[PDB]
Amino acid sequence: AITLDGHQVEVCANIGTPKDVEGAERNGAEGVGLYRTEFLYMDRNSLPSEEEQFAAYKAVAEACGSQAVIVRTLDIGGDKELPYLDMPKEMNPFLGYRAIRIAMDRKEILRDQLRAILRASAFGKLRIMFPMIISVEEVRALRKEIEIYKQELRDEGKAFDESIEIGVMVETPAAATIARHLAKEVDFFSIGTNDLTQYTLAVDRMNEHVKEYYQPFHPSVLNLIKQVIDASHAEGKWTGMCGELAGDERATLLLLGMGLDEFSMSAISIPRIKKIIRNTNFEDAKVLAEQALAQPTTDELMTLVNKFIE
Amino acid sequence: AITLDGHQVEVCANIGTPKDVEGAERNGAEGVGLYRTEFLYMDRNSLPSEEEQFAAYKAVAEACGSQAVIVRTLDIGGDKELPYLDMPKEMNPFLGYRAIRIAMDRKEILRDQLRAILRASAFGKLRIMFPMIISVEEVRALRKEIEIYKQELRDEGKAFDESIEIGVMVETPAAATIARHLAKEVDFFSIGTNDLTQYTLAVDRMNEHVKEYYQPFHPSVLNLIKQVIDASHAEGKWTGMCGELAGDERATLLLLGMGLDEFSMSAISIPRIKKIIRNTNFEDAKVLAEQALAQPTTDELMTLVNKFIE
Ligand SMILES: [Mg+2]
Ligand SMILES: [Mg+2]
C-alpha cells in the first residue's frame, strides 16, 4: 500500500494454518507477515517430522505465488500442555524454557524445522523468523546451524533457497535494546508487540488482577518499537509488526509515522488498514509520531493520536 | 567514598530488619540504600499494623543517626508468601499481582505502610522507594495518596518529614525507558538489577532450565542502567543500585564509569567495594564504560571489562 505522498508499506496477513491463506487472498494481503507453526506440534503424540512440516511449508510457499511468507519457528512453552514434549513444570513459563530456547537445547527440533523450511523455500519466497531472541550470540549460533543445514541439503541433493532471509521476531526488551547490533546480523525484524508489551510492562495480560496494566500504547513500548525500526533502517534493513497493534486502526497513522515498513494482521483487518494508509500523509504522520512518543503517560499519548485522527 | 580524581559516590548497606544496622555500621556503611520491608509481612497470619511497622521504621531511622535510609515498600506477591491475603494462583507471578500493584488495589496496605514511614520520618532521614513501577501515572497516584496521608497525620497531630523524598526502584524495562519522564517527578532512582535483568532478558533466574540466560552483564541490561543514570542526571537527580550487581567487584569500575551515584549492598561487601572505588580513576572508568556498553555480546563486554581491570 502507498500513502498519499508516495510512501510504500507492505500490508500482510498473519496465518495460523495453510487454510487461512484463502482469507488472506480474499482480503487483499500483499504477503504473509507471520506464519505460525504451532499447529504442527499440537494435538499429537509425537514431534512433527521434517517431511510433515515440509508438506505444510511447501503448500503455503506455492499458495502465495510470488509473495513472501515469513515462517516463525516453534514459539511454544510449558504454559501449553503438550505431554510428548516433556516440558518441565515452571513457576513463570512466560520467562522460561520456551520457543527458541527449546529448539536450541533439543537440536532435533531446530534441525527438523529449519531443514523443512529450507527445502520448502525452493518453491516460493520464504523467510525464517526466530522468536524469543535476547542476544546477538543466539543469532550467530542459529546462522551457523542454518549454514550447516544448507550444506547437508546440498550433500543430499535437495533444493533450497541459498539466499533465504533471516529475521528476529523482536518481543523481548533485550532485543529491542540491542537492535542496532542485531540489525547487522539479520535481514529484518518483526515486532511481536503483544509479548513486547507484556515483558516491558512486566504484566501477564491473562492475569485477571493485573490485566489493566497491559497497554500496547504505553510510551515505553512505542519508544522501544521506534528504536527497533530506526536500528533496522540504519543498517539498510526493514521492520514489520505482526503483533495485534498492527491491525489496530487507532495505531496505523502512528506506526506509519514511526517508519514501520510492514503491517501484518488477521486478514479481515487488511482492507481497513490499507484504506487508512492510502489516505494518510507520511510526512504529517512522522510529525505526529514524534509528538506522540514524547508524551509521559499512555493517556496523554493516546489523547494526542486520537485528536490527530479526528 | 571518593575516587582518586575526586568523584564522590555513596556506599550504603542493604538491610532487611533493624538488626542488620549493626553490621552495616561495623562495615562502614555511609547509609542504607535499601531497607526491605518484607520481614514485616512474612512469617505471620495477619497484615502488619501501622504501629508495628512504625516501630521497625523508627528504630532504623534512629539507629542510623544522620544517615539516610531508603525504605522500599511491600515488594512481594503470591499465596505462598502472603497466604493470609488469599492471593489467587498465578501462571506467571513474576508478571502478576505483586508489590505496588497489591498496595494500590488494597489501599489499607498502602495506607498502613506509608503512614508508618511518614511517622517514622520524624525520627531520621527516611526516603520512600516504590518497586515495580512502570508508569508516570502510578507515581502521580502514589503521590496523591501520600498527600492524603500527610494531611491525616497533620489532623492527628503526628510529626512527619514534610519534604520526605520519593523514589522509584527501577526493575521494569518500562521504567528504564521512560526514565527521563519519571526523573521529573521523583527524587531518585535505585536500580534493582536482579529483577531488571530477569524482565529485560525474559528469564526467571530460579528456573534451572534457563538459568544460563540470566546475565546481569548483558549489554541490554547495562545500557538500560546507563539510560536511567543519564536521565536522572539530566533532571538534577541521582541513581543508586541496590541489586546484587552493586556488591560485585567485577562491576564496580564499570558502574562507576557509567556514572552510578550510590552503591548499596550486603554490609559485608562494603569494605571491598569501597576500596575499589577509592583506588579508581572516574575519568578512566568513564572511557571504559563507554567502550564496554558498545559491545554486542555479554562475553565481549565482560572480556573488555576484565582486561581493563587486569
Ligand atoms: Mg512470545
Ligand atoms: Mg522485584
Tab-separated table of C-alpha atoms in Angstrom, chain A residues 22-303:
chain	number	residue	atom	x	y	z
A	22	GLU	CA	-7.670	-18.255	1.370
A	23	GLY	CA	-8.910	-15.464	3.631
A	24	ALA	CA	-5.632	-13.602	3.174
A	25	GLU	CA	-6.036	-13.631	-0.613
A	26	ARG	CA	-9.734	-12.772	-0.358
A	27	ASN	CA	-8.820	-9.704	1.716
A	28	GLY	CA	-6.007	-8.401	-0.481
A	29	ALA	CA	-2.977	-9.429	1.577
A	30	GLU	CA	0.297	-8.398	-0.052
A	31	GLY	CA	2.080	-11.354	1.528
A	32	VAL	CA	2.218	-13.223	4.815
A	33	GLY	CA	3.999	-11.425	7.632
A	34	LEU	CA	3.612	-14.249	10.147
A	35	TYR	CA	3.076	-17.955	9.523
A	36	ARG	CA	2.703	-19.549	12.958
A	37	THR	CA	3.954	-23.121	13.093
A	38	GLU	CA	2.486	-24.274	16.437
A	39	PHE	CA	-0.397	-26.112	14.754
A	40	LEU	CA	2.154	-28.682	13.566
A	41	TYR	CA	3.186	-29.537	17.145
A	42	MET	CA	-0.199	-29.588	18.892
A	43	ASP	CA	-2.922	-32.216	19.257
A	44	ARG	CA	-0.469	-35.041	18.583
A	45	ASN	CA	1.662	-37.552	20.482
A	46	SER	CA	4.980	-37.027	18.670
A	47	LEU	CA	7.079	-34.258	17.200
A	48	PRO	CA	6.139	-33.422	13.594
A	49	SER	CA	8.671	-34.864	11.172
A	50	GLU	CA	10.738	-32.827	8.739
A	51	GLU	CA	8.637	-34.321	5.931
A	52	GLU	CA	5.307	-33.429	7.546
A	53	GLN	CA	6.484	-29.873	8.195
A	54	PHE	CA	7.897	-29.577	4.667
A	55	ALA	CA	4.500	-30.511	3.205
A	56	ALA	CA	2.862	-27.636	5.103
A	57	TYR	CA	5.580	-25.054	4.437
A	58	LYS	CA	5.650	-26.005	0.757
A	59	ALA	CA	1.866	-25.670	0.477
A	60	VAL	CA	1.995	-22.077	1.741
A	61	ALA	CA	5.067	-21.207	-0.342
A	62	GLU	CA	3.237	-22.245	-3.516
A	63	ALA	CA	-0.139	-20.904	-2.406
A	64	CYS	CA	1.309	-17.386	-2.088
A	65	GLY	CA	2.702	-17.300	-5.638
A	66	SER	CA	5.434	-14.659	-5.749
A	67	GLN	CA	4.556	-13.104	-2.374
A	68	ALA	CA	6.849	-13.657	0.598
A	69	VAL	CA	5.895	-15.739	3.635
A	70	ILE	CA	7.605	-15.175	6.999
A	71	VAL	CA	7.753	-18.500	8.827
A	72	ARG	CA	8.098	-18.210	12.602
A	73	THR	CA	9.906	-21.110	14.220
A	74	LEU	CA	8.465	-23.011	17.156
A	75	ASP	CA	7.054	-20.488	19.610
A	76	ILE	CA	5.582	-22.589	22.413
A	77	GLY	CA	6.335	-23.320	26.039
A	78	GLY	CA	5.226	-25.146	29.176
A	79	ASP	CA	2.155	-22.941	29.613
A	80	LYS	CA	0.748	-25.128	26.829
A	81	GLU	CA	0.128	-28.754	27.833
A	82	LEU	CA	1.782	-30.970	25.191
A	83	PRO	CA	2.915	-34.008	27.187
A	84	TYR	CA	5.056	-35.633	24.485
A	85	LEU	CA	7.358	-32.603	24.667
A	86	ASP	CA	8.254	-33.470	28.290
A	87	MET	CA	8.209	-29.810	29.314
A	88	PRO	CA	9.073	-29.171	32.982
A	89	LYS	CA	6.731	-27.534	35.454
A	90	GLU	CA	7.655	-23.845	35.701
A	91	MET	CA	6.809	-21.052	38.130
A	92	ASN	CA	6.920	-18.460	35.321
A	93	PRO	CA	6.587	-20.186	31.934
A	94	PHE	CA	6.498	-16.859	30.067
A	95	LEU	CA	10.064	-16.294	31.349
A	96	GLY	CA	11.088	-19.924	30.937
A	97	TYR	CA	12.083	-22.833	28.713
A	98	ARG	CA	10.156	-21.864	25.630
A	99	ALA	CA	10.300	-21.232	21.910
A	100	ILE	CA	13.889	-20.896	20.621
A	101	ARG	CA	15.264	-21.990	23.995
A	102	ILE	CA	13.645	-25.389	23.474
A	103	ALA	CA	14.862	-25.689	19.886
A	104	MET	CA	18.434	-24.694	20.733
A	105	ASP	CA	18.558	-27.182	23.597
A	106	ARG	CA	16.933	-30.019	21.618
A	107	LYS	CA	18.692	-29.753	18.252
A	108	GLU	CA	16.349	-32.350	16.736
A	109	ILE	CA	13.552	-29.774	16.892
A	110	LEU	CA	15.606	-26.966	15.371
A	111	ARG	CA	17.048	-29.220	12.661
A	112	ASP	CA	13.726	-30.773	11.605
A	113	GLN	CA	12.037	-27.378	11.268
A	114	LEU	CA	14.860	-25.406	9.665
A	115	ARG	CA	15.615	-28.188	7.183
A	116	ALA	CA	11.901	-28.311	6.299
A	117	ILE	CA	11.698	-24.538	5.790
A	118	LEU	CA	14.879	-24.578	3.695
A	119	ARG	CA	13.523	-27.353	1.467
A	120	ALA	CA	10.179	-25.573	1.096
A	121	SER	CA	11.919	-22.308	0.192
A	122	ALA	CA	12.751	-23.799	-3.205
A	123	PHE	CA	9.052	-23.494	-4.128
A	124	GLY	CA	8.314	-19.899	-3.102
A	125	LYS	CA	9.657	-16.892	-1.245
A	126	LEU	CA	10.032	-17.923	2.396
A	127	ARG	CA	11.719	-16.062	5.261
A	128	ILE	CA	12.775	-17.518	8.617
A	129	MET	CA	11.910	-15.603	11.800
A	130	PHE	CA	13.095	-16.606	15.272
A	131	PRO	CA	11.088	-15.768	18.415
A	132	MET	CA	12.248	-15.016	21.937
A	133	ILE	CA	15.722	-13.781	20.927
A	134	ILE	CA	17.613	-11.798	23.569
A	135	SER	CA	21.207	-11.914	22.339
A	136	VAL	CA	23.477	-11.493	19.335
A	137	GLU	CA	25.151	-14.810	20.177
A	138	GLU	CA	21.858	-16.700	19.765
A	139	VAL	CA	21.500	-15.285	16.249
A	140	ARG	CA	25.141	-16.060	15.457
A	141	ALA	CA	24.638	-19.673	16.599
A	142	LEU	CA	21.406	-20.023	14.600
A	143	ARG	CA	23.063	-18.695	11.440
A	144	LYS	CA	25.837	-21.245	11.890
A	145	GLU	CA	23.245	-24.011	12.191
A	146	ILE	CA	21.381	-22.776	9.104
A	147	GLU	CA	24.617	-22.927	7.085
A	148	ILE	CA	25.292	-26.439	8.379
A	149	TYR	CA	21.790	-27.495	7.329
A	150	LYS	CA	22.216	-25.907	3.900
A	151	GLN	CA	25.380	-27.960	3.431
A	152	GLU	CA	23.536	-31.118	4.483
A	153	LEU	CA	20.786	-30.416	1.943
A	154	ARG	CA	23.430	-29.854	-0.744
A	155	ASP	CA	25.122	-33.110	0.225
A	156	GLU	CA	21.743	-34.829	-0.102
A	157	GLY	CA	20.783	-33.322	-3.465
A	158	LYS	CA	17.843	-31.351	-2.057
A	159	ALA	CA	16.969	-27.887	-3.381
A	160	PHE	CA	16.650	-24.804	-1.200
A	161	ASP	CA	16.837	-21.026	-1.468
A	162	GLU	CA	20.510	-20.376	-0.729
A	163	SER	CA	19.759	-16.682	-0.105
A	164	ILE	CA	16.870	-17.254	2.313
A	165	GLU	CA	16.323	-14.210	4.506
A	166	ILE	CA	16.522	-14.456	8.285
A	167	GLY	CA	14.843	-12.262	10.873
A	168	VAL	CA	14.242	-11.769	14.566
A	169	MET	CA	10.762	-11.535	15.993
A	170	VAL	CA	11.532	-8.747	18.448
A	171	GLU	CA	9.474	-9.417	21.568
A	172	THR	CA	11.955	-9.034	24.406
A	173	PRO	CA	13.164	-5.700	25.815
A	174	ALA	CA	16.671	-7.082	25.453
A	175	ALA	CA	16.337	-7.498	21.688
A	176	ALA	CA	14.837	-4.015	21.348
A	177	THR	CA	17.748	-2.510	23.281
A	178	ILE	CA	20.452	-4.234	21.203
A	179	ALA	CA	18.510	-3.798	17.960
A	180	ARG	CA	21.342	-1.939	16.211
A	181	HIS	CA	23.693	-4.852	16.878
A	182	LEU	CA	21.021	-7.347	15.820
A	183	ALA	CA	20.266	-5.389	12.630
A	184	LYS	CA	23.784	-6.233	11.496
A	185	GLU	CA	23.191	-9.976	11.864
A	186	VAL	CA	19.748	-10.453	10.274
A	187	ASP	CA	17.799	-9.213	7.289
A	188	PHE	CA	14.696	-7.885	9.046
A	189	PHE	CA	12.803	-7.540	12.284
A	190	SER	CA	9.178	-8.164	13.044
A	191	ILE	CA	7.823	-6.821	16.351
A	192	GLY	CA	5.700	-9.161	18.435
A	193	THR	CA	4.017	-6.273	20.192
A	194	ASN	CA	1.741	-8.336	22.435
A	195	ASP	CA	4.723	-10.067	24.047
A	196	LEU	CA	6.966	-6.981	23.918
A	197	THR	CA	4.241	-5.166	25.859
A	198	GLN	CA	3.971	-7.925	28.450
A	199	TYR	CA	7.722	-8.192	29.061
A	200	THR	CA	8.310	-4.407	29.038
A	201	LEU	CA	5.472	-3.583	31.422
A	202	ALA	CA	6.118	-6.801	33.406
A	203	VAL	CA	2.497	-7.874	33.036
A	204	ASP	CA	0.831	-11.161	32.079
A	205	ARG	CA	-2.223	-9.816	30.284
A	206	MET	CA	-4.123	-13.053	31.015
A	207	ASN	CA	-3.740	-12.412	34.760
A	208	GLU	CA	-7.143	-11.082	35.774
A	209	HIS	CA	-5.822	-8.998	38.674
A	210	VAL	CA	-3.350	-7.017	36.531
A	211	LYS	CA	-4.890	-7.226	33.073
A	212	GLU	CA	-5.439	-3.454	33.032
A	213	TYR	CA	-1.677	-2.850	33.213
A	214	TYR	CA	-1.320	-4.259	29.676
A	215	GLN	CA	-1.246	-1.211	27.379
A	216	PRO	CA	0.401	-1.531	23.949
A	217	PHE	CA	0.192	2.287	23.564
A	218	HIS	CA	2.361	2.777	26.643
A	219	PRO	CA	5.150	5.252	25.769
A	220	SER	CA	7.837	2.766	26.818
A	221	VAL	CA	6.564	0.141	24.384
A	222	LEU	CA	6.160	2.578	21.483
A	223	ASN	CA	9.589	4.118	22.054
A	224	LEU	CA	11.117	0.639	22.040
A	225	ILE	CA	9.338	-0.041	18.753
A	226	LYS	CA	10.710	3.190	17.290
A	227	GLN	CA	14.190	2.204	18.475
A	228	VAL	CA	13.903	-1.123	16.647
A	229	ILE	CA	12.576	0.498	13.461
A	230	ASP	CA	15.349	3.086	13.455
A	231	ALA	CA	18.013	0.431	14.080
A	232	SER	CA	16.816	-1.615	11.103
A	233	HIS	CA	16.897	1.437	8.841
A	234	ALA	CA	20.378	2.479	10.000
A	235	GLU	CA	21.596	-0.865	8.587
A	236	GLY	CA	19.503	-0.707	5.426
A	237	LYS	CA	17.059	-3.346	6.716
A	238	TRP	CA	13.321	-3.122	7.483
A	239	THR	CA	10.921	-3.723	10.343
A	240	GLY	CA	7.482	-5.260	10.285
A	241	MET	CA	4.960	-5.865	13.016
A	242	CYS	CA	2.788	-8.926	13.422
A	243	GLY	CA	1.512	-8.080	16.888
A	244	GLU	CA	-2.102	-7.097	17.381
A	245	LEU	CA	-1.263	-3.389	17.330
A	246	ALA	CA	-0.521	-3.575	13.597
A	247	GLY	CA	-4.182	-4.375	12.959
A	248	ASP	CA	-5.374	-1.633	15.323
A	249	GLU	CA	-6.857	1.247	13.306
A	250	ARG	CA	-6.021	3.630	16.168
A	251	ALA	CA	-2.327	2.907	15.608
A	252	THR	CA	-1.987	2.879	11.819
A	253	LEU	CA	-1.095	6.541	11.331
A	254	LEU	CA	1.182	6.483	14.378
A	255	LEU	CA	3.053	3.365	13.226
A	256	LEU	CA	3.331	4.778	9.713
A	257	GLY	CA	4.861	7.950	11.161
A	258	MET	CA	7.263	5.860	13.223
A	259	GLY	CA	8.514	4.407	9.933
A	260	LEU	CA	7.117	0.872	10.152
A	261	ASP	CA	7.765	-0.888	6.848
A	262	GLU	CA	5.258	-3.713	7.101
A	263	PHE	CA	1.968	-4.358	8.894
A	264	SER	CA	0.837	-7.968	9.351
A	265	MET	CA	-2.565	-8.791	10.770
A	266	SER	CA	-5.613	-11.004	10.766
A	267	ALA	CA	-6.689	-10.829	7.122
A	268	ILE	CA	-10.134	-9.372	7.890
A	269	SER	CA	-8.456	-6.150	9.044
A	270	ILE	CA	-6.328	-5.701	5.911
A	271	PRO	CA	-8.826	-3.596	3.866
A	272	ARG	CA	-9.435	-1.148	6.712
A	273	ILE	CA	-5.735	-0.641	7.460
A	274	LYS	CA	-4.908	-0.397	3.763
A	275	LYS	CA	-7.525	2.339	3.375
A	276	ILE	CA	-6.057	4.337	6.265
A	277	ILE	CA	-2.575	4.069	4.771
A	278	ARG	CA	-3.724	5.198	1.332
A	279	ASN	CA	-5.429	8.260	2.892
A	280	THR	CA	-2.535	9.262	5.173
A	281	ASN	CA	0.291	11.718	4.524
A	282	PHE	CA	3.504	10.078	5.699
A	283	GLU	CA	5.334	13.319	6.472
A	284	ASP	CA	2.399	14.553	8.566
A	285	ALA	CA	2.285	11.200	10.380
A	286	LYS	CA	6.010	11.492	11.101
A	287	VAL	CA	5.417	14.783	12.914
A	288	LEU	CA	2.523	13.301	14.890
A	289	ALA	CA	4.586	10.222	15.795
A	290	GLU	CA	7.396	12.375	17.208
A	291	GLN	CA	4.992	14.358	19.388
A	292	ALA	CA	3.155	11.225	20.499
A	293	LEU	CA	6.212	9.263	21.597
A	294	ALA	CA	7.330	12.281	23.647
A	295	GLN	CA	4.270	12.145	25.931
A	296	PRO	CA	4.833	10.962	29.524
A	297	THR	CA	1.674	8.846	30.008
A	298	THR	CA	-0.402	6.430	27.946
A	299	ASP	CA	-3.446	8.664	28.310
A	300	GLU	CA	-1.645	11.784	27.086
A	301	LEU	CA	-0.115	9.864	24.196
A	302	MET	CA	-3.461	8.370	23.151
A	303	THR	CA	-5.212	11.716	23.525
